[PDB]
Design a protein around this ligand. Structure first.
Ligand SMILES: Nc1ncnc2c1ncn2[C@@H]1O[C@H](COS(=O)(=O)NC(=O)c2cccnc2)[C@@H](O)[C@H]1O
Ligand SMILES: Nc1ncnc2c1ncn2[C@@H]1O[C@H](COS(=O)(=O)NC(=O)c2cccnc2)[C@@H](O)[C@H]1O
Ligand SMILES: Nc1ncnc2c1ncn2[C@@H]1O[C@H](COS(=O)(=O)NC(=O)c2cccnc2)[C@@H](O)[C@H]1O
Ligand SMILES: Nc1ncnc2c1ncn2[C@@H]1O[C@H](COS(=O)(=O)NC(=O)c2cccnc2)[C@@H](O)[C@H]1O
Ligand SMILES: NC(=O)CC[C@H](N)C(=O)O
Ligand SMILES: NC(=O)CC[C@H](N)C(=O)O
Ligand SMILES: [Cl-]
Lengths: 665, 340, 669
């Protein structure tokens, strides 16, 4: 495959256009529309949506009832169709059309020189500033065909336009008022299989109406797990009694993909790349979506599929989509503040409940002065506080084996816990002898068993101290560690009584500590020590030198855990997010010296290591996993929760797919 | 008329409650619920909504399948009903109930010492952190009655609880996952005439889930031109694998009427005065609303109306609602900037 | 509540009767029926089912069309109805009745002086020895009412007879051939809410037809998750061309509850107590049952519920049910052998796969010479064998700390050396002695357990192997472990599925199969004799009996565990079941291998005490230990305790309601 073709990774480029209305002049509306569609063609778009009653103007009132206007609309529409023979995108053009007795408010769905369909507006508003049932007829329940340019084409509120070469691209078209009713045609359509929901809108602008437009469009994209395309009327509509801002916007599953200047001077587009695979995946996993479709089986099987071949460009056309470098760490400072709040509080509260259950025991914790331990200790302190329990019931322990520990003791004494040292070294010596390891005879062999003796002894001592003094062993291994198997399983740091860092990726612990210093509720000196830890630990490096940088691994982990995306898709997404340090945004707290940019070769390498460790090696360590709360919306790794997977499975197909699809550089 | 009685001007006081879950202890959940409902009574509320699976705890997994638990749930539920004989508000209490073959995730709608109804959850999520189809059965399409305390009461996803003395107050009840699907029971219900939409929710909290809760609840209140009552589970739910923030909130036609402290220490309420007349009027003028109901006439006439007499206090009880001095000039500076 | 009332524990007493047919004399058939019904009444039964065409005789052919016969049938049916006013059970009597144009092959459902309903046969067989469509009419699709004794009563294949005071008791009635077709009426009815499926059957006996009766009846009870009551025609049916064996049986969820003597001289009954709660629970947990009902919603909502108040006897009437002492260990030698074969094979095969995955590592196991470690070693050996891998990759380890010396460590060394594994001993004492001192010294037993597991893990790191745990299902249930750094943790637990009552018989199975050496067999029997016999003077206070002293006898806790894990039964129901199973050692069966010196009888007091301990340790304490549990294969049908499998429960939950129920309902003695 061409790795850099957005289309070949499941994307589909869509455009929401606002054009220059020339009320009463259909030929000039068709001119503006043709020019913008030709732009969409140059941009590689597959879809282009224009505003309500595009070809005549929405605001012309009883001028819709004049035969000369309807005739010019027909002529301009046929010109448009003929011109669309050389245009890539599917044009969705509003128009007042003649059928049976009346004129209906229709969107003509045009493609490659033919009319795929004609959708009538379903609910014509007749209230306040709207007088639509005067001039036009409702379409709710109209099926059959309509005759347009010597051809009988599908007509009704029950169409679907499915791309035969892009199965993720299945189009449905409603109009303005349609999406504001309790049961919108688009919802049925989505259950019926529509993935891109289009809305043509005239929408006279008003104080607070753009807010309502966004509310309903976003809510639609989320509830229907689909993409939503909205286009409103702009410059040219009669200002006899209304004004027009020409807003266009593109939503996808609740997230604004793009939007355009309000009240512009001149035509505007919103062009974006819709990840059909993200929709596919959200729908694969949300059983209740298909359950809802089944409950409404009769309503949903009555849709008609009009198949068409899009044949998109197969080359490099960029990616009109903002792939954030940190799926777990939003780069918008306000959103990151909210995220850190939520994470920190769910950790504290999960620990609080575990503590209340056990008659308020003690909290035994081994603190190394690194990030995860620091944060876990902060968490336990707050949990104990909110429960009105002495901080002296927290028992921090520095357990040296064979510079950073000073952070740990400074922090422990600042917080007010019970600090203590236990030099496991001698117990390690004894054990290494009793098993006959070369180090007890004096040859420096620092293999795995050497290091695991110390790790397991730290955990062993903590467990026995908990048993002796009546407490519980708080864990500190974080989500990215679980995803990679970067722990000692069993007798080791993997085991504990209640891990509060279990659901937190490594990349978000840094910002949780930054958040705690910012909130600074523990005190000034405590902020000083925490800040010290932050500056000390970043310049983890040891950890990230065998499993790769956690920025790239949390990127891959998010893609896998949330979407199950194949390796090639993760490589493409990571390369667009990370390959350039200047492009895209960075979250707060990243000095320009700690703002790296990774290459495709690096992404490919760490992706190989990731698929190997996550699908295959590491699973068994998560399989027997202490309790602890889920944090991110990307998921957790509990086998009693978000990740049910086998312990004895190989990652051959993932490595093989990387081999076949991801280029070496 | 008593000019200062909010009820006599079309208002109806509603409460969204988060209580103290005691997982596995139905009697203690009923205790917390009774205390909060007694508060709602003192506040003059007509409606009080509690979280998903209130009487047993939402997070207890296969403990729902133990006969001793189900039996204690039945006992606590009957105590609650009997105590509600002296309580003004309509109690909406979650519970795992026994019907036909399985246990359904139900909300018991209780009023003045009787059970007006029993609504089952419609879409049981079985994905990610959710394992609900294991223990419980879907209610989508279940009609008929259920036997609760020597009485056959209405059972199904098609109920409406209409106040015979407050025609603007017509209640419908869905549960959690119900409002997240493309076609939620509440929308049908609203076309069918429901004005106050209740949602009992367990909702394990997550980064960005409260945003989604608000998005869908507000979007529901706007699209359905109705009031939306949301109540999530709080302190007490098993933190084996999830955490719980206990958010409660009250929306009305897209506008947040009230909300409560997230991650509280102790029970919380959101009590607000819903202007049923504002809903009545928005619906009088939006023709396309009734047009939508007509297009779905068969779906919408199949609802069952359970009538009940609320008899609210007729005196001065304040007005739990922020009436802005300038309907044209919003007092929030950011909103006023946008408006200008 | 009365603790000894089978009814107040969800049971219902049912009867399948074969009577003395007197072909052509409806009065004489009503006489036999009334006598047997009065018997069932004295027994306290709620239901009594009689054979096809009871009042007339199934075999009287065209005499069914004689008006005098039909009239005598109606007269005897009305007599029966009137007499039933003082009869506890619901009578289901066959009769050829007049409706619209023809006579239908009906079962009259009679109760307390009134006719609850009239169910016609649905599929009249007309083939081979059967000529039923000649005299009678099919009832498939007949609804409405029928006039019987000046009363309009329900008539059709769509009825349900539900007890208003016994909600688990919902009766459906079909007739003979009905249950032999691809889609029997009883399956629909079960989906519709039927719990007891009744069959009136004439059934001329033939070589192998009792086999077909049993096959289909048991299959019905299993698939429909119901009780199936069967009654066939006996002495008195015309032997002009057929013979009649009068078989009656009562099935429950695929398990034969009762049956009667074939070809008897004189009438017979099969009376049993059906556990409605068992059905209720099987249906609570099998979502696909309700899934199937919903898929056929039209068929299943069309049923009509006829309500009747049974008012059963509230006293002690015993329990006509064989409750086995060892729910995990069947007392039938053939079934126990099959069980043990299956269990042993799934353990071996699960370990085989885990090993193939890891390119065949070594197998580190600490062997103390107790049952669980012994069996785990045997399984590991067999797994290594069948995968064609050197037995010297099995690393057994005796890690003693404070034991002075005992026969069990010799058991360990002897078995390991007889198997040909790689045995080594390592005295953890010093590390514990150091460890204790370092933490500033109950605690020391915790330290030893921790250090055993720590050392095994580090040795597996050193020599490139996986620690193979030995914890069994009973220890997991009750929390008899050291969590985390302790005997709970391993890389793969082969014994997790197996309860402790079954480990002994797995070892006996291995011995009797004798696939290993005769020396291996002798040492295994030594292990059995050593561990299952209490030490005269406690050997250092560590063995199997120590766990028994703290958590109660496993014979009782495995019983409670099966009930809880499979059926979710309330404590009082468990106490009732166990008290009937165990209180009398001379009654019921024992599995093979119990010398009559090891056959105890437990009291209500003991059952109640250990049940308190059990609900407290299972619902509340021990859950957090299972929550983080190594891999391993599920063994019994009763379930496992994996959090990724059969038991999803909270770690921070109290057992208060179960204790409160034990206090409110189970007597102190
Ligand atoms: N001096 C100390 N005092 C007290 N507690 C200490 C001390 N040192 C460590 N810890 C503990 O280990 C946790 C983090 O472990 S680690 O060093 O980041 N990673 C590994 O061991 C590792 C990596 C890969 C595979 N296997 C093992 C820390 O939270 C803390 O609980
Ligand atoms: N799927 C499995 N199921 C059950 N047991 C398994 C499975 N795979 C291996 N093992 C065994 O568990 C021990 C794992 O070692 S460790 O202390 O967690 N960490 C390390 O080795 C380590 C090495 C290199 C880099 N980073 C960490 C091993 O000895 C192995 O015998
Ligand atoms: N001397 C030994 N040599 C070699 N391996 C040994 C030795 N002793 C034990 N093991 C091992 O521990 C497994 C089971 O332990 S136990 O004795 O039944 N009970 C407990 O540990 C216990 C009970 C209650 C609370 N906490 C701990 C055994 O299968 C064996 O693998
Ligand atoms: N729900 C929980 N979640 C997480 N951690 C918990 C929880 N409850 C306690 N803990 C802690 O874990 C240790 C477990 O100890 S143990 O080695 O498995 N043996 C024993 O408890 C034991 C006690 C009495 C008699 N016999 C055995 C406990 O001391 C406690 O500190
Ligand atoms: N033009 C229309 O159909 C009405 C659209 C307008 N935005 C509304 O919300 O009603
Ligand atoms: N408990 C549930 O049914 C799920 C509610 C959860 N808030 C969701 O959006 O799916
Ligand atoms: Cl072990």
């Amino acid at each position: 495959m061409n790795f850099y073709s957005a289309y070949q990774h499941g994307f589909v480029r869509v455009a929401a256009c606002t054009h220059h209305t020339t009320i009463g002049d259909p030929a000039a509306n068709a001119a503006s529309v043709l020019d913008m569609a030709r732009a969409c063609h140059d941009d590689g778009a597959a879809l282009a949506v224009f505003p309500e009653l595009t070809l005549s103007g929405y605001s012309i009132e009883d001028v819709l009832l004049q035969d000369s206007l309807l005739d010019a609309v027909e002529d301009a529409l046929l010109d448009l169709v003929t011109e669309s023979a050389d245009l890539l995108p599917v044009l969705v053009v509003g128009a007042p059309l003649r059928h049976r007795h009346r004129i209906y408010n229709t969107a003509v769905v045009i493609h490659r020189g033919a009319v795929l369909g004609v959708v009538p507006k379903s609910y014509l508003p007749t209230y306040r500033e709207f007088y639509e049932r005067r001039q036009m007829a409702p379409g709710d329940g109209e099926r059959g065909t309509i005759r347009i340019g010597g051809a009988d084409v599908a007509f009704g509120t029950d169409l679907l336009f499915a791309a035969s070469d892009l199965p993720g691209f299945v189009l449905h078209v409603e109009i303005a008022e349609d999406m504001f009713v309790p049961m919108p045609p688009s919802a049925e359509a989505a259950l019926a299989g529509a993935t891109v929901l289009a809305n043509l809108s005239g929408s006279p602008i008003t104080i607070g109406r753009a807010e309502d437009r966004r509310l309903l469009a976003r809510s639609a994209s989320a509830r229907c797990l689909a993409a939503y395309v909205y286009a409103a009327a702009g410059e040219g509509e009669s200002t006899t009694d209304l004004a027009w801002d020409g807003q266009t916007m593109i939503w996808e599953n609740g997230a604004l993909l793009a939007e355009s200047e309000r009240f512009p001077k001149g035509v505007r587009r919103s062009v974006a790349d819709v990840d059909t695979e993200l929709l596919r995946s959200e729908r694969l996993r949300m059983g209740t979506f298909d359950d809802n479709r089944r409950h409404h089986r009769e309503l949903t099987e009555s849709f008609r599929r009009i198949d068409f071949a899009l044949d998109p460009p197969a080359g490099d056309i960029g990616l009109l989509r903002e792939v954030e470098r940190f799926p777990f760490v939003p780069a918008d400072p306000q959103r990151l503040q909210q995220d850190c709040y939520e994470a920190y509080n769910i950790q504290v509260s999960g620990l609080e409940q575990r503590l209340r259950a056990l008659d308020y025991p003690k909290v035994v914790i081994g603190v190394s002065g690194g990030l995860d331990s620091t944060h876990a200790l902060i968490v336990a302190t707050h949990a104990m506080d909110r429960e009105g329990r002495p901080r002296s019931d927290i028992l921090a322990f520095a357990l040296p084996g064979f510079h950073t520990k000073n952070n740990a003791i400074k922090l422990a004494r600042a917080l007010g816990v019970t600090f203590s040292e236990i030099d496991i070294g001698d117990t390690a010596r004894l054990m290494l002898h009793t098993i006959g390891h070369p180090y007890s005879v004096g040859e420096k062999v620092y293999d795995v068993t050497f290091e695991n003796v110390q790790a397991g002894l730290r955990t062993d001592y903590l467990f026995r101290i908990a048993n002796q003094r009546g407490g519980i062993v708080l864990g500190t291994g974080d989500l990215s560690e679980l995803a990679l198997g970067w722990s000692t399983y069993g007798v080791g740091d993997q085991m504990s009584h209640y891990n509060v860092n279990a659901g937190v990726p490594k990349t978000l612990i840094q910002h949780l500590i930054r958040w705690v210093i910012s909130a600074g509720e523990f005190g000034e000196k405590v902020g000083e020590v925490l800040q010290s830890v932050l500056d000390t630990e970043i310049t983890l490096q040891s950890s990230e030198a065998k499993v790769g940088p956690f920025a790239l691994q949390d990127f891959s982990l998010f893609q896998v855990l949330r979407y199950g995306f194949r390796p090639s898709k993760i490589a493409f997404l990571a390369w667009h997010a990370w390959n350039d340090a200047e492009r895209g945004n960075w979250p707060p707290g990243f000095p320009k010296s700690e703002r790296p940019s990774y290459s495709l070769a690096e992404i490919r390498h760490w992706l190989q290591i990731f698929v190997q460790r996550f699908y295959s090696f590491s699973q068994f360590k998560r399989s027997a996993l202490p309790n602890g709360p889920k944090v991110s919306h990307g998921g957790a790794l509990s086998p009693r929760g978000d990740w049910r997977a086998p312990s004895d499975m190989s990652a051959r197909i993932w490595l093989d797919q990387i081999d076949r699809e991801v280029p070496k550089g």
